[model samples]
Target: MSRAYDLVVIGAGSGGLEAGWNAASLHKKRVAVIDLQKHHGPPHYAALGGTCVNVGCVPKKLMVTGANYMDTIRESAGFGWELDRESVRPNWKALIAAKNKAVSGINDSYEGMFADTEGLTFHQGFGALQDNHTVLVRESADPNSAVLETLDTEYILLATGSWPQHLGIEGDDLCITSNEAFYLDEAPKRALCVGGGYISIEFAGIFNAYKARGGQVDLAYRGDMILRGFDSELRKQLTEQLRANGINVRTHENPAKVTKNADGTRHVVFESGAEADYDVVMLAIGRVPRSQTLQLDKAGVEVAKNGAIKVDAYSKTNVDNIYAIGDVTDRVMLTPVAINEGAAFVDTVFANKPRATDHTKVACAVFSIPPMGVCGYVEEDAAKKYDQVAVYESSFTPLMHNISGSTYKKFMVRIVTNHADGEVLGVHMLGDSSPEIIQSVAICLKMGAKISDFYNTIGVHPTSAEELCSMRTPAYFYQKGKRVEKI
Candidate 1:
């Protein structure tokens, strides 16, 4: 016999959680959200907030902040705040404890949200589609005892999210992923972050931030530049800044092998005839969707070659009454993107109102040591798409650094605009509080704000954000791979 539900969410991450909540609590439908037991593998563990909570966003940001303490300590003296400089150090275990506590709080909130809702169910198991309307769940790892129950669900959603990828080099298992990096009990004396993506850059910064004397950090990338798909200028600038900060950035090098040493060190040999040793090695290359094990073929649902679920803009799969959202679909993959898709799915299916999530104008931040944020088209895309493109830029020493006499880093702001109408095509920033600032700019850009509109709005003085609004002239005009200096 199969337990029945009006809707079944196969993962309790952000998208599934939102979908389940809206369907059960708002629409008054019977919904059950099935998730593997908390803390299962490399990229997932413990409780329902999904990647953002357990491993991806929350923990990454927490550790980024924790790692930046040394910079803060150095800057304090410039503010006339006499602090103990010599004795100050980072406590890795303490920060991990605090992060776990905060993560647990969110976990509990998800639990309470489900408990308070009248008909929503949270099931702990590995759920797979047995047929179009049936889901089989395994409660245990052992194959014999794994089969726990079968659910006859009317509507099914796959929100299985994604997991970190491995390098597949020799001794690869001996290295760690971002998942293990978060819970590491001790700060490594030397760390090697292998990849060119955001994860690689961010961890490189975090590890380099708290480096003790003789503590080294290196970032190896298989590409010519770091941050493969971002604005070209921003990528170049960020790479320069990272190198300036004593990061051993090596580009165009792929790892061929990793070998563990006897005295607790590992040596990585690059495909290009180079080698280095590190106390810890982390592979941050990329992530793959968790759809492979779901047995979607039995349900007749289509999937991409990369295993991402195939879905339309409305979050519906080819099989009606079945859907997918979040990283599992590989459409956007950001948490807010997932939430938007989830809500739109609920509205389209139950509320008798059809809606679609917008992908264009989604704001994103790379939480690197000196972070960066972006919204809308980058200069590269804007130049190609627009007939006339104007680029405005500003770079200066920030006010905090002025007071603190710190040369750790500088701030940069850029505005890509339509030369004819001054319509703001994109906004990019690299500095302190950039993510928060670009968040507001993201809204303005989404709402169709123009360069003149930004100029008309009075900026709060003595802030880094003022730079965004005060640019009066185009720094350069771009045309067909040519940069023209503007008067």
Candidate 2:
């Protein structure tokens, strides 16, 4: 870091990686990415593409895939697969080791990318900004190991991400978050998660999958379903389906105290006077910023009370040249979204673009029990402003899951318009490949696509995505002459 660079990107998560990777690999500009190697044990951000491949997406998916297999194997009897009376279970240590191996592979790939390309430097250390253009980097702990590094950049990008938050209750030491749940040495006999977040749903299925081998799970959330703000129908539908899959979801109870019992299990007591003893209690309520450290305030950057930094539409902070993205911004904390922001940072500042980033209409998915996803606004939201709202909804069993005799599939189409002619107001859905399907719809939504365009499009037969294009009936009926839209 002795040399002055054109761009200095902090954090090694998805947004940072994309920005850093693209800045170095694509633009071939003077760029360097600095991150603390301590956060992710062996496979730190310096190793892989970022948190997604290392701590976030890949590892979480490993647990999810394992859980999905467990559920399928449990229900195999319905499909007439023969089995022993004994339950099935995976070796937790082996799975963790395998997850570590996969994580190692990701690290190798990121390093290889840097090695294969020119003009990119990967610094494994703490990256802190002393000023907009200058960063003070602490290389390591040892006196000789600590290197005072300086980075001069025209643009500074912040990707310092978030970490799993813990409960303030006593004996919280006994519980785990998404960070530790995936790579445990041994699976807990009975695991409990206290949240309706997708992470909770994922863990529920994961432990349920483990039930075959000797695992029991209890999921406790304050709300009725894990996904509280999404479509009400799909949330409840998936919750019921998860219960059918054998995860005891405890709704309408607040987490009171979680303590360890004599038998090496956690005593999870709710405010409702309900107590359940389980091997593990996972807290997935939410995540807070990892920015308390790095000290952005030292450099005159403003962090919100919630610990996230406030960024404008261009992701620029109160000061120019110092920009932030990802969990630190508390605005659309997704990998792809962050990547897009990072790319824009390089494009506008380094690549010399006149305008800035357009962050509207970004879509994401939560891979829950079955799989829930969303792109745009729902009828509940769209109806608030527009007098005429057209909602097209269709629910059915996906052919693949129909063999399981579950009609758990759901899709939603919501349109809102006040003055503009027939523009589709919002697009929302909770089902398979929903992210991709809504991705296509997101284009129309952003362009102010008409509701007729939604109805007139040719349907792709036998596919869930086709339901949107094939919606002929509105949940609300159109009256004579005076109507939202005539069928």
Candidate 3:
């Protein structure tokens, strides 16, 4: 009644898929990957490529690019491109259709990959741990259905990822998260995005693009500032930039309640006694690890209070044969982190080479309107962790903005270094191409490059990235936790 495999992976997302592929093709192990082919809620059908391909990164970036085009059309007037800007309206339905089509293409490719790979089995179902070495596959979202199959494996990997959290307030059902936002047929005439996280800020930017067409967008956050864990100055600068872009960035406001109107709109009352109505209300408060339904308890696997599986440095759970990775483990939740963890997991288990992913100095980007990218320590963290911290920061208008007539848009770059040895600890940026620029800077930080190295290298002329290498002096210094002013 049960099939045996060398490895059985649950949740065919980034981490699971990568590990399954490598284990089967590279190591020639019999691998089984199980996942739900249909999502539980909106956008019911799911794709093989999981969240990154279907919902989170790919589609979101496409929409962000679409929003950026609106700004491009407006800025083109300064370059003598005399076009009717009023006629350039975004077709939200068309964009959504195209994005979904692209996602479908990726799904097909993933299916083909699994089909082509020998010794790799892809199961479309929900995977639950029956024991340390046994897994049960059942119909997703249907408990009464008979078990599709039972699988016994030497090792099991969980990469279930995370799900968006709701505010748990009155009429919260009327609100939508990023998952549903992708499948929307039409852009809202008015939108209210609640939270200070990257998702809220990104969606705020997307909705703000419609302002030129009489659309209104408000971004409310319970925290004092947006992007809480990022560099302090970049967070502040992003707030100002979002305000300059005509978004109502309201800080220290929490949604206490949400209500539905007869005309199919949403009414929200903030905890601060503020009230507003919008065509769409989104809550990007946070996401929780999707480990609840996996039945890890059946396998005697340990989990944290927040439903994240506890895994060792090499991605092993308490049970030697059980392991977890990606957002489900609550480690760095980026797609690349999960992919790297998968590769390392495969190498460690199948190749007989022990490996652990180095989580330090991992770079990340927040795809906001202008966008932000950072690597290594933030200014606040660097100040607390290092004895002597030197900070160099510069804010300037990009060269394109000078002729593009968008003077309000500014580019900011900050470098955090250890004053004792001039070792570069972090690089932070907010502006055009910050994501791409920070990725390259991440390489330098990973190699322990010092501040002098950046100073010694020649920079490309007339580029935003040149600012990363051109900052010569420290704006200020921090000794332990105290700031030392330049007199």
Candidate 4:
């Protein structure tokens, strides 16, 4: 404890843990992983597994699964099963308990991983840089928030991650962010999610599932279009499907003020003379770096204008010994991408394994209604990148929805290819299970599956994903060396 350590990793989130685990467990390097908890990682505000495992991805998707089942319940009459509407209400309390239990169970193992590691020390509290090679750990339980000890270290790694960025409107103090929504005492009868990004859209879908059966949900975005950067047709389809699910989609709008009504509910008014009354106001505008207390600027680390640490290929900052990775770096911010970067860091520094994390062709998922997952370039990007190209697409419904009570379960998949070699340049999906389905496609795309190869594969019978294989749509070909391009 009195000597300088090899590595001091600040943060126990996804990137931090991965970096620590890789360095200590695989590289056999001494590492100290610091977090703001008596346990290993993940704050109480965040669910048990950082952002993805905790309040962001894990719980969000689990609730989506439950909501999807609700859609099933609503569609049961078509399947020759009749159920009372009142009997289908989710026992919110029990479900929350189950979610918490599942979260804690995983956290228990994260601690065990540390115990099994030979050279890792798990410290409970905030670790801030006293200097480049020294860090001070403050006791969160201390009434005065004083530093309990100082750690001497050779290298410092920052992966404090990001937090939800709320909209700056009047009465913003009364609103809650995504993590708060997790610990909410009771689900609101009416909830308004402000923002057009994936987080807002996904939660809107979840809330709509609750609202369809006598629940009220309002999804408000400042732009007429949501899910920016997706294909135009697919984006349109998702917006329509969200509306079909009974979520009020208010576009080209911003909140003016939020006031508590006489009935003890909140009233949100828009600049365009639109108003929504709800029991809860959830701000899902976006996410910003969560390393507020890290004092990155003071540590001589250069952060971009967007408040992210500026890093090059090896995840190295201007200060050579001070490194930053994951969401805090303003890279892709996806959990897998961050984890891969962390692994790359360990490989370069200690493992003698020379690997640089690839940011190209990374895949992403938006767990809205049919769920949307995308890999490779956007269709437009594909058009611009190649000298010549072709696109294959499929759009339709899932078999489950056909027999289910709902008439709006739709799915769409698109793949663009370079005509020069028929190499599939991109894969996009907009439908249920898209997150998982895209994961499958991402692996194939990485393996160099061609557009024609996708055509030859066996279709998943009666499933929404089968549409990818049955691309009956016409191909849109674009050739390079063209004099001009138009949108």
Candidate 5:
């Protein structure tokens, strides 16, 4: 027998959960959400809340928070606090336990919400397209797995999310990805973090905190610099900061092979003819959509060459009744972006109000040691899109850092504006609290705030954020592809 639903959502991640709940409660539609329980480690399972709650943002942020305490402890010494710094050490086992406990609690809460919601059903199985209107719930994602149930639905939504990519090379299985890093048994004495993106940078920072205990962390990237698409100045400064923080940053190096030593250590050889031995090898290169196992071809839904589900502005797939959102679509992969897409999908399909989620001028952050935040275009991008671009920037040490006796630590803030009309094009910052500050800045950008507006507004005193409102002159101007003295 086949059960019927108004909407069937595959993958119970952030987007799927929101869409299912809203469709049932708000739109009065019969909805079913299906997802398989993911086992992260012993006694810990990622059931409902998906990657953000289980492994991605939530757990990673907790680890970042734990790593950040080392800086506070070191800075406290300058503030007349006498303490044994060596005693402050991260207990990897306890931290993992706490993270898993928090994730399990969130899973339970999601289950409770589903139970309380009327006309909403949560299925614990892998969902695949048996047909355009029929979905097969199987015990496993394998195509041959035993079918547990059949769901006949008017519309289907795919939010299967993305999986981290591994370097396809000899001994590839010997390395780990960011997903497995959270459940590590202990901190490594020598760690080799491959790739130059945010994940590698953040993990390097995490392990760098353990340097006081004789840990050595190395970050290797094949590119010319780290953070390829960010503002050039910010990228340069962050690279310098990473080196200053005792992380060995190696550019123009790629991991060609990974081999295990007899001592249980991993030996890695770079394409640049360099070699190193480490206790851990982690790949943070990139992620691809989890669209392959869904049997999207069976439903005639189009997917990109990279496996990203091809979706229209309304998140609809080529098949009229099918839709996709979040990382699976490879749009904006942030958790908040997925949530907003879910809401927009509901409004368009169920509420009779057609709405498209805006993807431009989105704010993002990289949780490096001091961290960085940005909204809108980079300087080069702004220059290409606009006739003339004015760039205003400042770099200085904050008051707290001064008192903390850290001279090398500094803050950077930049504003890219259209020269003719003073319209702000982008905002970028590198320092503590940059993430929080850029979020508010993104709202202003979305409202079409101008450069003069920032200059006219009063700023809070003795704060790092004040730099955003205080820059009155352009550092330089870019026209065509050339930099000039004046606009």
Candidate 6:
């Protein structure tokens, strides 16, 4: 007889870990989460908390903080802090040391999360679904010399997550994806980034800031502007801002190939007949679902053409016993969204409560140097859905910059609304503190707040967010892309 369990979750990521922990502690279900041990390679070598903790979010944000010090020190003198300019330099080793320490702590916390729960068990290794009720996990210190453990599960949840995508071009193997950026031994002196999404934009900001501390950075995007699906105004300004801030922003160019030079540098040739040399090249193309190895077909699980598991509104697959969630399902790829889906799954399956995960107006933040925060549709999308649209735009220097006089950065805020009843349809921001402010604004949008609701509320003085309440007059109005007077 094979070992049996009430539930076995494949891939102990944010979604899987949360689902497993919920099933075990709350519902008293015998649950086991099988995850591959951390190893640095193609499939991604992430610890327990998935991308948010191990590599993608936590590490990048720490690096973002490290990069921000360049501007802080430069403007410190304006704020009455005088330091030896020569003495202030980025100690690469120290920054990496600090980031590593934080990551290790987080990994331990994920382990402790299940350790405290008696009914939840964790196995370290790769899991392949054998059938509806059977899962074979290879757990060993050595993957090649792995021991296969067959677990008969009543229900199985797939949460294998996603990995950063790569460009399929000649010498593409010479480039590093965002996954490997966090584990880099040292910041490259000359770095070339490919891609236009948040990951690429954020890295370009980091590199530019790193350049401020004596490095060179270049960014290449195939599109005319970066951040493809974002607000056109914000995207255009951010492109200009990145270039002005010292990033060699190359628009209308895509990487064609890369070659290793004799000097141990990279020679990147773009499709536009352009080429550049860099100490390091990073590919931030995108991410794809990590369902290739899961072998869903073996278990009769339906999958999309993009390798994402096909699931219903309840996150249940065609096969009743199998379910999938998080990035693997090609749903909202944010960490919080994944956690919510996990909780919803637990509620519907075990807690006698059925609630589908809410997937609307998911607030997102892009951690560029200036950063960007958004909590609804962009102008294009808003115009399409609404009969009339009013866009309130605000661009000004925040109070913090008033004294510092940092002309390099400008804060921008926009409020999109329906002209009929002044319903606040979307709120987009680009500047320092946008992420922090947008989160609160997201609550108002979620509650179906209107433009009058913003006007009715008093705002805190000497704050960047005050612009939200002060913008009464419309900067412009749009109806089917036609300019119109105030609605």
C-alpha RMSD for every candidate: 2.2, 3.9, 1.8, 3.0, 1.7, 2.2
What's the C-alpha lDDT at position 197 in model 1?
89
Candidate 1: residue 232 Cα off by (Å): 2.6
Pairs that collide in candidate 1 are 38-46, 39-45, 39-46
TM-score-based ranking: 5, 3, 6, 1, 4, 2
Candidate 3's residue-wise lDDT over 89-114, tens digit each?
77888888888887877887887888
Candidate 4 colliding pairs: 75-405, 211-215, 370-431, 370-432, 371-431, 387-480
Instruction: Quantify all predictions' global Cα lDDT against the true fold.
Output: 0.84, 0.71, 0.86, 0.77, 0.88, 0.84
Whichever of 2 and 5 has more lDDT, that candidate is 5
Please list the residue runs of candidate 2 whose C-alpha ends up more than 4 Å from where it truly belongs after superposition.
Answer: 1-3, 38-48, 74-89, 139-148, 212-214, 399-402, 407-420, 477-487
Model 1 stretches astray by more than 4 angstroms:
1-3, 39-46, 140-145, 480-487
Question: Top model by lDDT, which number?
Answer: 5
In candidate 2, list every pair of residues with a backbone clash.
Answer: 47-107, 48-107, 87-212, 88-212, 88-213, 89-213, 196-226
lDDT of 5 by residue, 1-487 (tens): 2547899999788898899999999988999999887434433234577788887888888888988987888899878999877678777777788888877778788878888889898887888998889999998879999999999999999998988898988878999888888878888888999888999999999878754377789999989999998998999999998888789999999899899999989999988778999989999999889898888889899999999999999999999999999999999899899999999999999998999999999999999988999998998998888888999999999877788977777899999999989999999999999999999999999999999899888999989998888999999998865788776
Write model 6 residue lDDT over 101-216, tens digit each, in one string. 88888777777877799889887777887788988786543335455788899989999899888888998889988877776677788999889999998988776665435677
Order the candidates by lDDT, highest first: 5, 3, 1, 6, 4, 2
After superposition on all CA atoms, how large is the RMSD of candidate 3?
1.8
Q: Please provide, for model 1 over 83-168, each residue's C-alpha lDDT reduced to its tens digit, 9 standing for 90 to 100.
A: 66777877778888888887777777787887799989888877887898998888653444567888898999899899889877
Could you tell me how far off, in angstroms, the CA of residue 127 lies in candidate 5 after the best superposition?
A: 1.2
lDDT of 6 at 184: 69
Q: Tens digits of per-residue lDDT for model 4 on 53-102?
A: 66666777777776677666777877788667777776666666777777
TM-score of each: 0.95, 0.88, 0.97, 0.92, 0.97, 0.95
